[PDB]
Amino acid sequence: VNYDIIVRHYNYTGKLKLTSVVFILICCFIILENIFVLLTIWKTKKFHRPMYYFIGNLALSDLLAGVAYTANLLLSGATTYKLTPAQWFLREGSMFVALSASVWSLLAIAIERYITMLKMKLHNFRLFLLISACWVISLILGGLPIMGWNCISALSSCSTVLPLYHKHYILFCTTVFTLLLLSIVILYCRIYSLVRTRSRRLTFKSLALLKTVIIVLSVFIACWAPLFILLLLDVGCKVKTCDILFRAEYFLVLAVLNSGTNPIIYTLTNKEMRRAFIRI
Amino acid sequence: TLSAEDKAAVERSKMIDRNLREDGEKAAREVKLLLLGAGESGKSTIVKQMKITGIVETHFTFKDLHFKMFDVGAQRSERKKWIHCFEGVTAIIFCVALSDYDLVLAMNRMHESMKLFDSICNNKWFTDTSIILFLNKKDLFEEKIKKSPLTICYPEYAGSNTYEEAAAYIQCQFEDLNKRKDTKEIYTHFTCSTDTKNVQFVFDAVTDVIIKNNLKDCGL
Amino acid sequence: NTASIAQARKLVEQLKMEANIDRIKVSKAAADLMAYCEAHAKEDPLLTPVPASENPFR
Amino acid sequence: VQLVESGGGLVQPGGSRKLSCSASGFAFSSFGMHWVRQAPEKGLEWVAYISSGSGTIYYADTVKGRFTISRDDPKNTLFLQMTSLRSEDTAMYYCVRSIYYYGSSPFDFWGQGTTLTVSSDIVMTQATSSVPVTPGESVSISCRSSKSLLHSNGNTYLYWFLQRPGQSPQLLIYRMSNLASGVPDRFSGSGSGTAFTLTISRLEAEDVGVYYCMQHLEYPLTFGAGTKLEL
Amino acid sequence: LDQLRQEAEQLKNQIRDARKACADATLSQITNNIDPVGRIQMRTRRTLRGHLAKIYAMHWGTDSRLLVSASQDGKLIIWDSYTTNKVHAIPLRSSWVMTCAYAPSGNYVACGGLDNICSIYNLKTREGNVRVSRELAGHTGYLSCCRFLDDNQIVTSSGDTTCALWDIETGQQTTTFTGHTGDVMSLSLAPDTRLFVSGACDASAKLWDVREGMCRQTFTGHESDINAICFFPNGNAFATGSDDATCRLFDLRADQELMTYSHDNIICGITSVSFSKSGRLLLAGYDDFNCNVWDALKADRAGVLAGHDNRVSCLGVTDDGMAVATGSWDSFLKIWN
Ligand SMILES: CCCCCCCCc1ccc(CC[C@](N)(CO)COP(=O)(O)O)cc1
């Protein structure tokens, strides 16, 4: 754990406060929204069903991601080369874990909905199974860099955005993200198709469902596209050959802001929520 | 820290729980319909034409759905002491007869049916519960109208002795009473006494209720 | 008719029967109720809880 | 109620044999079943136990591994399969009924039994193997044990049975104090841990036989030596 | 007719005068030197699960150890309350059931509902299963409740303005009690088992005899129908819970109501009431998802057993007084002490 290593890397790639204020304000806004949603959910006796527990889980994941991003912002700057390798590795891992947990919660909600609307619950093992799976896989994926995955042994194999993260880590994580996004899109498209087909055959504003599907998917993709694109580019460029990578600080601010609109897209299209949010 | 006998007691209790859950899962598949109408409103012909003391239950099957239909009209008591028992049913089938438009009971039978429908449709227990409305005896209604217009009981009527005009005006006069149009809904039909369409219509209304309940259930 | 006359007579007789009863000063009723509430106090397990040792439900 | 067993006879050393028991007159698929046995001139001995739902089984340490116990509810039958029989296994064998829930009475109905011939636990003993009595005499009998039976939930798993000459046993007192149904009220039993006493008032005829005491605290189940009233 | 009406009015005025004359004081004006109990902190010890529908009644056994509960999925269940073990489960013929009872000897149970008959089951057979022993018929409207007198006599009430006393062994009514105008909701046998009390859906209650057929007393004062009724232990009192959001305490010797039990924040109707042993806790459900615990001698509290997600329909205490059971439309039974 010799800090000299750190320094050399930040020289090899080329790295070696209003913006922070704006970002921390954004984080406070997100925290306020998520805590309001949690308080409204967990204190209405009609809101004690599995779906509302899934919603609370998503809100909790968003809160954790916001807090982690705030903490990471507070400790950047020159301090980036005044720490021991382990502390910096932990600082990165916390952010990464929260960012994975958010998407896993979204997928859990999508799967639950899709199951409910199939000829399978028409008219609580899966609950704990899904929550455990999401949290455990998030933690497991987060903690690799301490367990051997790093390029301190070869500065030639390091990236530009993260000069101590072997490129295989980045590629693997982006593959995971792409898989999850495709799965969610497929699930929601199929739900809409199913409802339309079922209600299209009765003879004697039929759906007006497209509204929520469009809102959800459009916001999700429009918020999460840039960081994914930037990291995919980063894994594809040579050292000190692309200069955009020195601007990533303004891209991540979107990937976390996505955690501030879910408490609205999953709260304003629901009538009963809209009625219960008269007084949080 | 259990003796030799408490473990057998626990095994017995778990067997009982197993059987209870099996029965509940089997019983969570059926549809319940509550049937209502006025005196001589013709619910008997609906019960009959489909080939199907206290409460009287009948049941049938159709296109993979198992219907239980309960008739409670065989009691003469105060209506308000039951409906909590029925707040779970899927739908309410309400029957009235058209030919009785000018038969004075005082004032007419249709006025009695209007009062009954207005009372039921806006009861506090039925806010999400839908109603399927049957208008019966259309042929005799048309025969009577040919000589006696609706002005006898609907002086404000604007049409003449035309079947469509009178029937549509009466239909709207009843379907107006739906004062909860944003949560409840009303279906309407004309008894096809020689057809099978009645059961298909019941099937369609029930399926619509099912789909709407499933959409509301999962937040979507 | 005869039925209404019978109903009126039955109501009158029932009222007369109910009236022909000795009354009790409300003070004595209150004293008796309070006395019964005082007598069995120590044996009311939910007004004076049973210590956990002798509890059947823990 | 009726239990009828079959499958006995003679078996030479080695070989095997299967005994069957048919039940009629009750809900066979709610009861657990025991197999018990008795030597020609000695006390009783428990053999095996099968439970309701087949989720539990127990055997005796003496001959474990050679005996199999099975049931068939749709046909209401109970089977025991035994192999490689020795000369030690000449005896008569009974099938017994028992149902456990809060307040029930196990071991109440006994079968009739079949004869078979071949060419760290709790101890309990009867004080005496015989006693002379006369009609009108107040009789009492004793049993001793090597450990307390009073479990900390309040029970006391002592049982008293009676076998008249040429019949099957007949439950008298279950859990050390309670009288089975159909027993004249002149019987009674009590005692303090490890020392117990049965008492028969106003001795009549048909009260002469052999009296046994058993415990049901923990498998294995151990019988007594057997006491006799001579008269 | 008209002269009979005049006599009725004169007797009514005389009864009013007699009732008012004895009112030298009010319970609250004498029972004002009493330390209030204060807070009553209760908690769930067990949670009895297994029903899959609304629960409409329960009733304790005289040993204080076993329970019987009835739900609208068509099931009676018998519970061990010390371990949460099921001892028996009994399937019913019709699922529109509204009342239960437990035999004082433990041999039998009874039930009834919207089918106009009362069914009696025997628990202790040599065959090892529970099976029906009797079905009583003769009533013309639905059935509200039924309480064993012994192994061979049962009293029932129905929404027809009538009640009946039945001899189980034969199946024929032994006497009938008439004189109401609306439906009958609930009745409670006396501790000494020689009278009973009946409330009807006209805000009127009565004290009824058993072997004569003739009512001894009548009581009025509520504004709407009566939803529950029970009997304070001493033998000469009873508390009414009505659907106009009120409770009141009626006594038989004074011939008038003494104390009322209401709160402005309550706008619902009580679905069941019960007493505590000594007489210092009156327990009452409501339609606002709670189950309050009032103090009888003061009208000054409500300790809440807030554990349910729907309306509390049934609640009861034991004979030794060490527990309380409650059941509600959310399909769960809870035990408190
Ligand atoms: C399914 C999930 C997909 C992957 C999630 C993408 C987030 C990964 C991530 C990258 C970088 C950072 C930290 C970046 C900085 N802390 C400021 O932006 C660099 O600072 P200096 O050390 O260059 O000064 C945090 C998380």
Number of residues written out for chain E: 337
Residues preceding discontinuities in chain B at C–N > 2.5 Å?
52, 106
End-to-end CA distance of chain A: 49
Count of H-run helices and E-run strands, chain D = 0, 20
Amino acid at A7: V
Residue B111 makes CB contacts below 8 A (sequence gap 6+) with B105, B153
Q: Tokens representing B187?
A: 């279906």
Examine the domain organization and report whether D8 and D36 are in the same domain: yes
Q: Which of residues 33-52 of C touch E (CB under 8 A)?
A: 33-34, 36-37, 39-41, 43-47, 49-50
Q: How far is CA E88 from CA B2, D67, E77, E78, in A?
A: 21, 34, 6, 5
Confirm or reject: Cβ of A212 under 6 Å from ligand 1: no
Burial A254-278 (b: 16+ CB within 10 A, else e): ebbbbbbbbbebbbeebeebeebee
Q: How far is the CA of A10 from the centre of ligand 1 (A)?
A: 15
Determine the Cα–Cα distance for residues C25 and C28; give it in Å rounded to an integer: 6
* Location of structure tokens 């409650």: E326
Determine the Cα–Cα distance for residues B120 and B94; give it in Å rounded to an integer: 10
Q: Tokens representing B192?
A: 């096809």
Give the helix, strand, coil percentages of chain C, each rounded to 5: 65, 0, 35
List the residue whose alpha carbon is closest to atom 24 of ligand 1.
A77
Determine the Cα–Cα distance for residues B59 and B68; give it in Å rounded to an integer: 4
Examine the domain organization and report whether D177 and D216 are in the same domain: yes
Examine the domain organization and report whether D90 and D165 are in the same domain: no
DSSP E162: E
Residues preceding discontinuities in chain C at C–N > 2.5 Å?
none
Q: Which of D118, D147, D166 lies at the terminal end of a domain, its last residue?
A: D118
Determine the Cα–Cα distance for residues D159 and D176; give it in Å rounded to an integer: 6
Contact E129, E146 (CB under 8 A): no
Contact A98, A61 (CB under 8 A): yes
CA atoms within 13 A on the CB side of E279: 22
Determine the Cα–Cα distance for residues D4 and A240; give it in Å rounded to an integer: 95
End-to-end CA distance of chain E: 58
Q: How far is CA E236 from CA A260, C15, C36, E274, in A?
A: 66, 20, 12, 16
Neighbours of E113 (CB within 10 A): 25
Give partners of B (≥3 CB pairs < 8 A): A, D, E
DSSP D143: E
Strands D14-24 and D124-126: unpaired
Amino acid at A49: R
Give the helix, strand, coil percentages of chain D, each rounded to 5: 5, 50, 50
Could you write out the three-class secondary structure of A173-184? HHHHHHHHHHHH
Q: How far is CA A116 from CA A49, A138, B21, B215, in A?
A: 13, 26, 20, 9
Q: In a 3-state reduction of DSSP, which class is residue A69?
A: helix
DSSP chain B: ---HHHHHHHHHHHHHHHHHHHHHHHHTT-EEEEEEE-TT-SHHHHHHHTT----EEEEEEETTEEEEEEE-TT--S-GGGTGGGGTT-SEEEEEEESTTTT-B---BHHHHHHHHHHHHHT-TT-SS-EEEEEEE-HHHHHHHHTTS-GGGT-TT--S-S-HHHHHHHHHHHHHTT---TTT--EEEEE--TTSSHHHHHHHHHHHHHHHHHHHHHT--
Please give the backbone phi and psi of residue C14, each rounded to the nearest 5 degrees, phi first: -65, -45
A178: left (phi over 0), alpha (psi -120 to 50) or beta: alpha
Nearest residue of E to residue A43 by CA position? E309
Residue E181 makes CB contacts below 8 A (sequence gap 6+) with E161, E200, E202, E204
E64: left (phi over 0), alpha (psi -120 to 50) or beta: left
Confirm or reject: Cβ of A6 under 6 Å from ligand 1: no
DSSP D157-191: -EEEEEE-TTS-EEEEEETTTEEPTT--TTEEEEE
Confirm or reject: Cβ of A170 under 6 Å from ligand 1: no
Determine the Cα–Cα distance for residues B220 and A54; give it in Å rounded to an integer: 14
Query: Burial level of E39, CB count in 10 A (0-12/13-18/19+)?
Result: exposed
* Residue ranges covered by each domain of chain B: 27-215
DSSP A166: B
Which sign does the torsion angle of CA D169, D172, D173, D179 carry?
positive
Contact A17, A28 (CB under 8 A): no
Domain extent, residue D62, equals 2-118
List the residue whose alpha carbon is closest to atom 9 of ligand 1.
A96
Examine the domain organization and report whether D213 and D135 are in the same domain: yes
B219: left (phi over 0), alpha (psi -120 to 50) or beta: left
Contact B91, B32 (CB under 8 A): no
Q: Which of D118, D140, D159 lies at the terminal end of a domain, its last residue?
A: D118
Determine the Cα–Cα distance for residues B18 and E274; give it in Å rounded to an integer: 34
Asked if the Cβ–Cβ distance from B54 to E183 is below 8 Å, we say: no
> Could you tell me which of B40, B195, B56, B50 has the C-alpha nearest to residue B109?
B40
Neighbours of D80 (CB within 10 A): 22
Examine the domain organization and report whether D36 and D82 are in the same domain: yes
Determine the Cα–Cα distance for residues A234 and A223; give it in Å rounded to an integer: 19
CATH number at residue A217: 1.20.1070.10
Q: Which element (helix H / strand E) includes A19?
A: helix A18-41
Q: Which of D93, D118, D143 lies at the terminal end of a domain, its last residue?
A: D118
Smallest CA–CA separation between B17 and chain D, in Å? 14
> Could you tell me which of A26, A60, A99, A58 has the C-alpha nearest to residue A265?
A58
Domain B27-215 has CATH 3.40.190.80: no
Contact E234, E2 (CB under 8 A): no
Smallest CA–CA separation between D8 and chain B, in Å? 31
Determine the Cα–Cα distance for residues E328 and E318; give it in Å rounded to an integer: 18
C/A Cβ contact: 3+ pairs below 8 Å: no
The strand pairing partners of E77, in sequence order, are E69, E89
Contact D85, D53 (CB under 8 A): no
Confirm or reject: Cβ of A76 under 6 Å from ligand 1: yes
Domain extent, residue A163, equals 3-277
Query: Burial level of E308, CB count in 10 A (0-12/13-18/19+)?
Result: buried
CATH number at residue D220: 2.60.40.10
Determine the Cα–Cα distance for residues E308 and B112; give it in Å rounded to an integer: 41
Determine the Cα–Cα distance for residues B113 and B94; give it in Å rounded to an integer: 10
Largest CA distance in chain C: 72
Q: Tokens representing A201?
A: 């055959």
Contact B141, B98 (CB under 8 A): yes
Q: Pick B9's closest partner by Cβ from D53, D56, D100.
A: D100
Strands D210-215 and D227-230: antiparallel
Tell me if A172 is assigned to a ligand binding site.
no
Asked if the Cβ–Cβ distance from A112 to B28 is below 8 Å, we say: no
CB < 8 Å to B218, chain A:
51, 112-113, 116-117
Q: Which element (helix H / strand E) includes D212?
A: strand D210-215
CA torsion angle for B112, B114, B120, B126 (degrees, to 10)? 170
The strand pairing partners of B68, in sequence order, are B32, B59
Determine the Cα–Cα distance for residues A182 and A205; give it in Å rounded to an integer: 29
Strands D158-163 and D210-215: antiparallel
Q: Tokens representing A2?
A: 């010799």
Determine the Cα–Cα distance for residues A216 and E327; give it in Å rounded to an integer: 42
* Location of structure tokens 């009406």: E5
* Location of structure tokens 């050292």: A239
Q: Tokens representing D4?
A: 């009828």
> Could you tell me which of B88, B191, E126 has the C-alpha nearest to residue D27?
E126
Confirm or reject: Cβ of A100 under 6 Å from ligand 1: yes
Number of residues written out for chain B: 220
Domain extent, residue E22, equals 1-336
DSSP E170-215: TTEEEEEEE--SS-EEEEEE-TTSSEEEEEETTTEEEEEESSS--E
A48 and E CB contact within 8 Å: yes
CB < 8 Å to E87, chain D:
101-103
Taking each helix axis from N to C end, the angle separating A125-142 and A50-74, rounded to the nearest 10 degrees, works out to 20
